[PDB]
Each structure stands twice: as structure tokens, then as C-alpha cells.
From a paper:
The crystal structure of a C-terminal truncated Sfm1 (Sfm1ΔC: residues 1−204) in apo form was solved by the single-wavelength anomalous dispersion method at 2.0 Å resolution and refined at 1.9 Å resolution, and the crystal structure of the full-length Sfm1 (residues 1−213) in complex with S-adenosyl-homocysteine (SAH) was determined by the molecular replacement method at 2.5 Å resolution. These are two Sfm1 molecules in an asymmetric unit (ASU) in both the apo and SAH-bound Sfm1 structures, which assume almost identical overall structure with a root-mean-square deviation of 1.0 and 0.3 Å, respectively. In the apo Sfm1 structure, all residues of one Sfm1 (molecule A) are well defined; however, a significant portion of the other Sfm1 (molecule B) are undefined owing to poor electron density (residues 79−99, 106−136, 152−162, 185 and 187−189). In the apo Sfm1 structure, the two molecules in the ASU are arranged in a non-symmetric manner (related by a rotation of 145°) and the intermolecular interface involves mainly the C-terminal his-tag, α7 and β9 of the CTD, and the β1-α1 loop of molecule A, and the C-terminal his-tag, the linker, and α7 and β9 of the CTD of molecule B. In addition, the intermolecular interface (between the SPOUT domains) buries about 730 and 1431 Å2 solvent accessible surface in the apo and SAH-bound Sfm1 structures, respectively, which are much smaller than the dimer interfaces (between the SPOUT domains) in the dimeric SPOUT MTases (2 670 Å2 in TrmL, 2 732 Å2 in Nep1 and 2 427 Å2 in TrmD) as calculated using the PISA server. Structural comparison shows that the apo and the SAH-bound Sfm1 assume very similar overall structure (root-mean-square deviation of 1.2 Å for 202 Cα atoms); however, the SAH binding induces some notable conformational changes at the active site. Particularly, on the cofactor binding, the β5-α5 or L2 loop, the following α5 helix, and the β1-α1 loop move towards SAH by about 3.0 Å. These conformational changes lead to formation of a more compact active site and thus several residues of the two loops are either involved in interactions with SAH or in appropriate positions to interact with the substrate.
Consistently, Sfm1 has no activity towards RNAs but can specifically catalyze the Arg146 methylation of yeast and human S3, and the CTD is critical to the substrate binding and the activity.
Residue numbers in the entry:
A (entry chain B): 1 to 78, 100 to 105, 137 to 151, 163 to 184, 186, 190 to 211
B (entry chain A): 1 to 211
Amino acid sequence: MKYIIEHMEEGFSEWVILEYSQILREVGAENLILSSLPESTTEKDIPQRLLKLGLRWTTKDLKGINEDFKDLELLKDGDYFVFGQMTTDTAIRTTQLIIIDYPEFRFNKNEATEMPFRYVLKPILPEGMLDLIKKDSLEHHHHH
Amino acid sequence: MKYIIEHMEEGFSEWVILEYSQILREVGAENLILSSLPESTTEKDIPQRLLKLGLRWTTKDLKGINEDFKDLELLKDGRVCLLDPRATIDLQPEDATKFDYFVFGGILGDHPPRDRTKELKTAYPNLLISRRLGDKQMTTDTAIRTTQLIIKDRIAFEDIKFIDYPEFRFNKNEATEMPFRYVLDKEGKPILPEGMLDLIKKDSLEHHHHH
Ligand code: NI
Ligand code: NI
Ligand code: NI
Ligand code: NI
């Protein structure tokens, strides 16, 4: 299975960079395509971390993918899996498997954050995601 | 007095950036050093706000600071104070002649449990003298403000006006308690870093539980 992700909004959040990086490291650059990027986009609009991993991306929609990437299997009516709750990397991780819900992460200094998604468990996160979650977690506090 | 904070963790959380920024604005960039940063740290890892404020940092421990920052006075044995919650002697105004540096030991995880105070003292048994700052936990910026009041202004701990565990109410159904002792300003309000109350308010609007 190959994966297509529509990324239309401008710029790449750190969250998304970590997610796409994990996906690339798990299925490989030949199995992921970003489609429908803003017309503005050139190759320095793309994060260096993603470029280093060989990210396939285009401004064309998913039907223009075979136009831009001649080494890919044609998109046929009715092989590919498209992203128009799980995180995107979790969703892809499970699909790979086939072919814990609302986990609470507890950190140092009495901090904790629960994440509003289902995850795969020996929870699997993109590399660096735990640090990013920690980064937005507020100092030890009590809700009254 | 100069301040050393062991920052022995990857990353800078937003609340930590606000606290460090407040410390830098208060004591100055020449008087704060972050030490024992993860070995992989480069300037690119330091928040832009802190770089612009002149933050000094090193991956070396506190005994490597003088080598990295040649303008600083030497760390001298017995003249470096370690904040120590297990100590009984509070920092007093008379300690101002005794200490040149005040150290916040790193806070590490529970895997495995570590006693950073004992690690530091075992590494450098001639170096550190323990002091307490009262019997209630403070945020780092509050601890530094408190130390300034005691050492610079010569105000004894028992004469500083504090509030313990202030509660910040954002509406009739939501309030947040910060489980720390804070210094009061002259209007009777706890002194928080710029932006911190906003951050607390932002968290209040987000998903949370009360049990
Ligand atoms: Ni309570
Ligand atoms: Ni609430
Ligand atoms: Ni909260
Ligand atoms: Ni919940």
C-alpha cells in the first residue's frame, strides 16, 4: 500500500514535520506522496528534514500525481490510501500492520497531558513527539 | 550573586522559556548560566527569545563554566551555594559574604531515581554548601527573586511577603491553583513571569479533569 496526504495549508508545523518524518522512516519515500500543496510552493518551502528523507510532494491533486511521478503505479478507479480519530502516522502504522485510547502522558515535575487519539502499543509516537507534547505542557498546577 | 541552573533535559517548554526570560530580565544575562545541557545541544536548540536576551549555556557541568565564560569570577570551594530542600539552614543575609554562586540542581526523572545533590557533592566534595529557601517549593524565578531579596537587599526570609498556593480564577466555573510559594508585589499579587498568567489561562480553556 502507498499513501497520499493532502497538505493544502501554508507551512509545516513542527508536529506535522515529526509525523511525516516518522511515516517516511516507516514506509519509505517511495510509498508516501504529499498532494495539493499551495501553488506558491518550491523546494525551499519544504522542511530540510523532509527533503533529506526524499519526500515526494506536488501542487497538483492526487490525479496529477502520475503526471509528476512517472515511477508510480497509476491511480486506478476503485493500491493507494488517501487522507482528505487517529494521528496520521498512527493511521498509517495500523494499515501497514494489517497488510490505547486517550492515553495520559506523565512527565517529570508532576506534569501530565492526555492526547485525544487512539494509539498503537511492547503508545507509539513519532520520534520527538513526546518532547513536543512536553513543550506545551503547563508547569505543575491544579484545576479547581 | 550569580545563578547556575542545571538544565538536564532535552527541550525548553514554553513555561520554562517564560521563567528563564523573567530571570534574565531581573538579574541580567551575565549573571545566569545554564549548565549540563544534553551533549547534543547546539545554538540552534536554544529558543530565539532566550538567545536575544543573551542566555549563557553550556553542556559542561558547573565546574566547566569558568572555562567557557572567561569573564566570570572563579567558582571557589565553599563559596558555591546549592539549593537543597533536604537542608535545614535557610539562606540568610549574612550569607552574602560567603557565596558567589547559587546553584539549582538538575531535576531528573524516576528511571532510575537519582539524588542530584549527592551526585554533585560526590563529584566535588570541597565545592558546595547547602542552603534551604524556606519549607515550600518555589518556581525557579521566584527562588531567584527570593535569593536577591536576601543576599542583595539583605531582607531576611521571614520578612519577605509571600503567598502560598495562589489560585487564579478565570470564570465562575474554572480556577487554577499553582502549588508554589510566590513573592508578592506591592499590590498584594503574586509575581509571575511576563506571559505566565496568559499561559495558565490558555491551559484553563483546554481539556482537563478535576479528578
Ligand atoms: Ni485542589
Ligand atoms: Ni475545570
Ligand atoms: Ni491544565
Ligand atoms: Ni480527558
